Structures are given as structure tokens and as C-alpha cells.
Amino acid sequence: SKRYFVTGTDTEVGKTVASCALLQAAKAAGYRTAGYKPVASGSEKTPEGLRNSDALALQRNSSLQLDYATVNPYTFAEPTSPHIISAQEGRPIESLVMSAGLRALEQQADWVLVEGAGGWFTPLSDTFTFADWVTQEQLPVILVVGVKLGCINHAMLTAQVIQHAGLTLAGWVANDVTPPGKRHAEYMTTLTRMIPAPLLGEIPWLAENPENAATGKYINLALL
Ligand SMILES: Nc1ncnc2c1ncn2[C@@H]1O[C@H](COP(=O)(O)OP(=O)(O)O)[C@@H](O)[C@H]1O
Ligand SMILES: [Mg+2]
Ligand SMILES: [Mg+2]
Numbered sequence: 379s380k381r382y383f384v385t386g387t388d389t390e391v392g393k394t395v396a397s398c399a400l401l402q403a404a405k406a407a408g409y410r411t412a413g414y415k416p417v418a419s420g421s422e423k424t425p426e427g428l429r430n431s432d433a434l435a436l437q438r439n440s441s442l443q444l445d446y447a448t449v450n451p452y453t454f455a456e457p458t459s460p461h462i463i464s465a466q467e468g469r470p471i472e473s474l475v476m477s478a479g480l481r482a483l484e485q486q487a488d489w490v491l492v493e494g495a496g497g498w499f500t501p502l503s504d505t506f507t508f509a510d511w512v513t514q515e516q517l518p519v520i521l522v523v524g525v526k527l528g529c530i531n532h533a534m535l536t537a538q539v540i541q542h543a544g545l546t547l548a549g550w551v552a553n554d555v556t557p558p559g560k561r562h563a564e565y566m567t568t569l570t571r572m573i574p575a576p577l578l579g580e581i582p583w584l585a586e587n588p589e590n591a592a593t594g595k596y597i598n599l600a601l602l
Contacts, residue, residue, distance in 0.1 A: 379488040380409070381480070382548060382602075383517040385540075387532035389496040391524025392553030392581065394432045395588045397493045398439040399581055400520070400551070402594030405441040409489035412440050415450045416476040417495050417502060420457025428453045432493060435589040442486055451479050460508075461501035471502045473511050480515065492517065498536050509543065518548035520578070520602075523569060524555040530568055537573050547575040549602050554583040576601045 384400070386393040397413060404411045413436025421430040426446070433450035440449070452471055454463040464471050483490050494500065500508045512519065519540050523533050533550070540547050550573045552566060570577055579597040581588070 379484055379490065381484070381490045381492065381517055382520050383492045383494060383512050383515070384520045384522060385494045385498050385512075385536065386522040387497065387524060387529055387536060391522060391526075391529075392551075392555055393493055393522045394435050395584075395593070396520075396522040396551040396553050396581060397432075397491055398435055398589050399579070399593035399597050400491055400599075401436070401439040401441075402592065403597035403599050404489045404491070404594075406594050407599050410441055410487050411489045411491070412442055412444060412483040412487035413437065413449060414480060414483055414490060414492045415495075416479055416492065417452045417460050417471055417508070418450050419454040419460050419463055419495060421453050421455050423455070428455055436491070436493060438590070440487075444483075448479065448482055451475060459501055460495055461503050464503070471506075473502075473506065473514060476511055477515065497532075498539060509539070513543050513545060516545070518546045520548055521550040521573065521575070522553055523550055523573075524553050525562065525565055525569075526555055530565070530572065533569055533573055537575070541574070547573070549576045549578040551578050551597070552580040554581060557583050578602055 384397050415433040418430035421428040437449045456463045581596050584591045
């Protein structure tokens with residue numbers, strides 16, 4: 379069944395918003411979908427336990443009715459690097475558990491999207507990063523680019539390292555994190571030339587609750 383890992387040029391660039399658009403597009407295409415945020419930090423308390431906002435968005439945007447824990451097995455309250463808070467709270471992050479969770483979703487979904495945490499090299503332990511897990515799973519990678527000054531360098535750095543890891547950069551998504559500025563078209567042209575993967579689409583600046591906006595329309599899944 380189809381599976382994609384979604385990474386970004388940094389934290390706070392639109393990975394979650396773009397992942398929701400991707401999931402909406404896949405449901406529209408007739409797939410049985412599931413979003414997966416194996417590791418999450420920066421989460422709020424509820425009577426059921428901690429809930430992360432990205433995991434909730436992926437859950438809501440999945441075509442299947444999924445239990446929270448199946449979407450997000452590892453939830454940390456403090457918004458810091460996963461390895462730091464995992465070591466502090468004595469709750470190790472295990473590659474095998476992350477992988478089992480992906481398999482569990484595949485029991486029911488035929489199209490699974492996995493959202494990473496932070497950027498490509500976010501540490502999970504003092505000796506293991508998210509990039510290590512993606513490499514183990516041999517997942518095709520989708521790069522989310524928040525269109526802003528500095529994004530060309532970050533997109534190029536991320537694409538080069540993914541390629542060096544022997545992984546496939548399946549595509550990229552442009553996300554308009556701020557209102558339109560002067561060199562938007564020039565930036566889009568530059569990124570299109572430099573990133574060695576198809577541009578899947580562009581999400582416009584959507585000030586109010588973009589995670590639940592109808593954004594599937596901005597993604598062309600036939601390019602993926
Ligand atoms: N296209 C968009 N339009 C306007 N707001 C955006 C857009 N994309 C992201 N946001 C806002 O920017 C912040 C970071 O987006 P998010 O998808 O959570 O980033 P990441 O998952 O990369 O950390 C959030 O507050 C989100 O609501
Ligand atoms: Mg975030
Ligand atoms: Mg996110």
C-alpha cells in the first residue's frame with residue numbers, strides 16, 4: 379500500500395497543514411487513508427492523557443475513524459527536541475515501536491502519510507535521529523517548504539541530505555506561511571528549478587484554521 383514521510387525545511391513551516399491537504403486529496407482520490415505522527419512534543423492535557431495538535435489534525439483528516447494512540451504512540455508535553463524530553467521523562471523512543479505503529483495502520487489503510495517532528499535531523503535519542511528511522515523504513519519523502527527568506531538554502535540542504543541517504547524525494551509542497559510579498563514568483567521558480575522532485579502543489583495563505591480548511595484541491599496526487 380502507498381506510504382509517504384512528510385518532512386519540512388524547519389519546524390513551524392507548515393508540515394501539518396500540508397499533511398492535512400495531502401490526506402484530503404487522497405480521500406478525494408478514493409483511498410482509505412491514515413495519518414501517523416509517531417513522535418510528538420508540545421502537547422496539552424485532556425482527561426484521556428496528553429494530546430498533540432498535529433496528531434489531532436492528522437486524526438481528523440484521516441478517512442478512517444482511528445484511535446488517538448494509533449495515530450500518535452509517543453506524546454510529550456514540552457515543546458523541545460524529542461530526545462531531550464524523552465531522556466528527561468525516562469520514556470525511551472523505540473524504532474521498533476514506531477515501525478509497528480506504521481504496520482498497524484496499514485492493516486486498515488491503503489494510503490498512509492507519516493509526519494515527522496521538526497526538520498530532517500531531529501534527534502530521537504542521543505544516538506538516533508528521525509532521519510535514521512526514515513532510512514530504515516525506506517519511505518519516499520515529501521518535502522514541505524515554507525516560502526520565506528532562507529527557504530532556498532533549507533530546501534537545498536534537506537534535498538541533498540535525503541539524496542545522500544539513498545532515499546527518494548517523492549515531491550515537494552510549497553506552503554505560503556505569510557501573505558504575498560514581492561519576489562513570491564521568483565522564489566517559486568527558484569525552488570522549482572533547484573528541488574529535484576515534482577512540485578505537488580501550493581497552499582495559499584489561510585489565516586484562520588488552515589488545518590481544517592478544504593486544501594485537498596491544492597494538491598495534484600497524480601504527480602506523486
Ligand atoms: N498556509 C498557511 N496559511 C496560514 N497559516 C499557516 C499556513 N500554514 C501553516 N500555518 C500556521 O503556521 C504555524 C505552523 O504550521 P504547521 O503546519 O503546524 O507547521 P510544522 O508542522 O512545520 O511545525 C501554525 O500556527 C499554522 O496554523
Ligand atoms: Mg509545529
Ligand atoms: Mg507539525
